[PDB]
Amino acid sequence: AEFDAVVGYLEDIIMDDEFQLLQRNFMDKYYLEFEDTEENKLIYTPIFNEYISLVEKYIEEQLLQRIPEFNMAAFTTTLQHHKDAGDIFDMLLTFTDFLAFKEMFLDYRAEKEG
Amino acid sequence: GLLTILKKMKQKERELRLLMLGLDNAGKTTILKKFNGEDIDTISPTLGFNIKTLEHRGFKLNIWDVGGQKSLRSYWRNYFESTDGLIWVVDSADRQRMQDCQRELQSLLVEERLAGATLLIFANKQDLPGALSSNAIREVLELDSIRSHHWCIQGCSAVTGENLLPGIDWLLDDISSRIFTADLEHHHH
């Protein structure tokens, strides 16, 4: 449906590299709160939730630059139900994995050092 | 939103998330360290949180261990979401804080995000002669008056790793039963 179209744009928005810049600019603000130890800091969490909100929000903005009447909830509801999934949702899931998010941050920190 | 909805409408049947909480010095971090059979000496009080993803009876147990230091407890709630099982750890020999351990456990149980969780109580440090019995600890904490959650109290000694597995096996079975029950009523009505 109008569904298969959004699924197409997701791939285009996240595998674009304005997204990768968005990610870098986010990390630039917090990267040195991140330590390379197994124990995590409580402060990683609010940063993590901030990151999730940011990605989610960059999405909806870019998605309605495409379809100016795109309602996030409608797509999400229609998804959180009866069109149930794929290959890019797997990368979408990536953003909610806390451990990979931390490693993303750790590799970045080492990079920034130098 | 999309990202978080995606996550749960996608978790696999046999991934479980367990949140291990309790007063500082209860032995939370010693316990999960022992689960992997990692050495447990050189363990320091947790200022943040530890995540250890397990493997037991076909289950992948993602266990979050959060520091119990008092100045840290207000942040416990940032870890409530998506908890299949709550593990409350108790230093059985810490007789003078049994009331606060009680107060702390009680406030967790009226917490909305923890509405579904199975509750496993580890009466840890039974190796200590001053350790209160499980029954005494069950009396305090007034566990018998909990009808909001399924719970069980397992006396143990993280230091020797004695009785940790039976605790976990009860927890997994209870979690399985709840899910089983929900699925049953879903497909029928």
Ligand SMILES: Nc1nc2c(ncn2[C@@H]2O[C@H](COP(=O)(O)OP(=O)(O)OP(=O)(O)O)[C@@H](O)[C@H]2O)c(=O)[nH]1
């Ligand atoms: N005698 C005895 N000591 C234990 C036992 N379990 C843990 N300990 C010790 O108690 C102390 C605190 O243990 P922790 O695992 O750090 O307790 P914790 O709840 O994770 O502490 P926080 O990080 O502050 O929350 C350490 O010295 C442990 O070695 C036990 O079963 N018996």
Ligand SMILES: [Mg+2]
């Ligand atoms: Mg600890």
